[PDB]
């Protein structure tokens, strides 16, 4: 579509190395460094992700609590008596 | 040579004591690498098959 490898950009003085997929393990150090990585990733975002959704649960735990209280009858039987 | 794919290309067989580098080396434009590596490997698979 008028754009393909060959004219994308001008790259100079960059050397890359790579291995054959058959000469390297597909799952290298999965839990050795992947698990410590996810802890690093989660911390970097838990201060921007959790607080917005923590508030929603607070709305949930209060909006639903008040709704049942409305359906619950209140002791307003005075002024009629026997 | 029909569609001017490469400026140069050659086939080599470097031999060592227990190893070697059997393959090919080609010189072409910056918009002809894929067009000849496709026919270069296509020729290899023809002899094998």
From Swiss-Prot, chain A:
SUPFAM superfamilies: Ubiquinone-binding protein QP-C of cytochrome bc1 complex (Ubiquinol-cytochrome c reductase). The modification N6-succinyllysine is found at residue 33. GO terms for biological process: cerebellar Purkinje cell layer development; hippocampus development; hypothalamus development; midbrain development; mitochondrial electron transport, ubiquinol to cytochrome c; pons development; pyramidal neuron development; subthalamus development. The chain crosses the membrane at residues 40-68. GO terms for cellular component: mitochondrial inner membrane; respiratory chain complex III. Residues 69-82 are mitochondrial intermembrane. InterPro entries: Cyt_bc1_su8, Cyt_bc1_su8_sf. Belongs to the UQCRQ/QCR8 family. PANTHER family: CYTOCHROME B-C1 COMPLEX SUBUNIT 8, UBIQUINOL-CYTOCHROME C REDUCTASE COMPLEX UBIQUINONE-BINDING PROTEIN QP-C. Component of the ubiquinol-cytochrome c oxidoreductase, a multisubunit transmembrane complex that is part of the mitochondrial electron transport chain which drives oxidative phosphorylation. This is Cytochrome b-c1 complex subunit 8. It comes from Bos taurus.
Curated annotation (Swiss-Prot), chain B:
It is found in: Mitochondrion inner membrane. Transmembrane segments: none annotated. It comes from the Eukaryota. Component of the ubiquinol-cytochrome c oxidoreductase (cytochrome b-c1 complex, complex III, CIII), a multisubunit enzyme composed of 11 subunits. The complex is composed of 3 respiratory subunits cytochrome b, cytochrome c1 and Rieske protein UQCRFS1, 2 core protein subunits UQCRC1/QCR1 and UQCRC2/QCR2, and 6 low-molecular weight protein subunits UQCRH/QCR6, UQCRB/QCR7, UQCRQ/QCR8, UQCR10/QCR9, UQCR11/QCR10 and subunit 9, the cleavage product of Rieske protein UQCRFS1. Belongs to the peptidase M16 family. UQCRC1/QCR1 subfamily. Component of the ubiquinol-cytochrome c oxidoreductase, a multisubunit transmembrane complex that is part of the mitochondrial electron transport chain which drives oxidative phosphorylation. This is Cytochrome b-c1 complex subunit 1, mitochondrial. The chain holds residues 333 to 381 of 480 of the full protein.
């Amino acid at each position: 579509m008028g754009r393909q490898f060959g004219h994308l950009t001008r790259v100079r003085h960059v050397i890359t190395y790579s291995l054959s997929p058959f000469e390297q393990r597909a799952f290298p150090h999965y839990f050795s460094k992947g698990i410590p990585n996810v802890l690093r990733r989660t911390r970097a975002c838990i201060l921007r992700v959790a607080p917005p959704f923590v508030a929603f649960y607070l709305v949930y735990t209060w909006g639903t609590q008040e709704f049942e209280k409305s359906k619950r009858k209140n002791p307003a039987a005075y002024e009629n008596d026997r | 040579a029909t569609n001017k794919l490469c400026q140069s290309f050659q086939t080599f067989n470097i031999c060592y004591a227990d190893t070697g580098l059997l393959g090919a080396h080609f010189v072409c434009d910056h918009m002809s690498i894929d067009d000849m590596m496709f026919v270069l490997q296509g020729q290899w698979m023809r002899l094998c098959t």
